[PDB]
Write a protein that binds this ligand. Sequence first.
Ligand SMILES: O[C@@H]1[C@@H](O)[C@H](O[C@@H]2CO[C@@H](O[C@@H]3CO[C@@H](O[C@@H]4CO[C@@H](O)[C@H](O)[C@H]4O)[C@H](O)[C@H]3O)[C@H](O)[C@H]2O)OC[C@H]1O
Ligand SMILES: [Ca+2]
Ligand SMILES: [K+]
Length: 303
Amino acid sequence: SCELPSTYRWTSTGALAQPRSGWVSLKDFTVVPYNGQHLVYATTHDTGTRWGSMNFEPFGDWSQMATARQNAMNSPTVAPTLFYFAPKDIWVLAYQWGGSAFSYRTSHDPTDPNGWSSEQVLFSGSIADSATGPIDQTLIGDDTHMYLFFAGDNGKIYRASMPIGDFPGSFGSTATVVMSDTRNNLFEAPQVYKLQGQNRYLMIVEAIGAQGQRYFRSFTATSLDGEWTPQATSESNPFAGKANSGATWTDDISHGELIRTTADQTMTVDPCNLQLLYQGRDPGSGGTYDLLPYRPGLLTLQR
Ligand SMILES: O[C@@H]1[C@@H](O)[C@H](O[C@@H]2CO[C@@H](O[C@@H]3CO[C@@H](O[C@@H]4CO[C@@H](O)[C@H](O)[C@H]4O)[C@H](O)[C@H]3O)[C@H](O)[C@H]2O)OC[C@H]1O
Ligand SMILES: [Ca+2]
Ligand SMILES: [K+]
């Protein structure tokens, strides 16, 4: 195995796909391996006010993301988390802005954008001092428990848990704060992973830098119910950001996901081959947040 570096150095692609006509952005990627291909769901925004979601047809290599058919979902699953819940042999798509704080649906065929079950409650809690409410869930399981982590655009990261045999189901209405900082330092888009070959878990969180540029900070833990330790936690020393991305097509390195070695709920990633599918936007872009022209990019860690 390969230890996480204390200084990350990446190289980047440019934008890997453009939104199909009618959408201004592709955002908040979730991605699994599927039958030897990449299966990606994403948030969309249209040219008016509508948040939506989509998947890409499975594609074999990252050059094929640009040509993969983009399939709209009839019922949106904004800021989605996709995984295979192996203990009950069912796929799960979790998301926000349905009927409760967080929702999920299930399927046996995650390539079908419109093949998901009816909406179920994932979380029904509220949080304090948040303009948005709970946002950007991520889920991960260990041997005995499933965990829900989320943010609130408020400087806090929250955790709920349930015995793994009780999942899929609702985590209830309460959560535990596991980290807090100034609003901009722990802002949104948390993602939690288990590192292959190591007794260690990795959390990355999106932050807002001094001039508004998005970047990620990282933290580690040795158990998912334990405490989190800063691993790379500033704009000049980030997990991934303009300081170290190798990207100039974007300054932002924002809401996305690490490439995983498995689709299942363990969220396992290979520390020897870390890659981040992120959302970025042209540095000249501006105006109202919801219309910003985000697109996917991929970072590959140098070792
Ligand atoms: O009922 C649902 C609505 O609540 C939901 O509203 C969206 C809620 O999320 C909003 O996106 C948040 C908003 O702002 C971004 O952060 C700002 C970035 O610029 C900074 O200068 C500023 O300080 C920050 O606050 C944050 O990144 C983003 O996640 C979105 O604007 C609302 O449209 O819409 C769906 C309904 O079903
Ligand atoms: Ca996410
Ligand atoms: K967002």
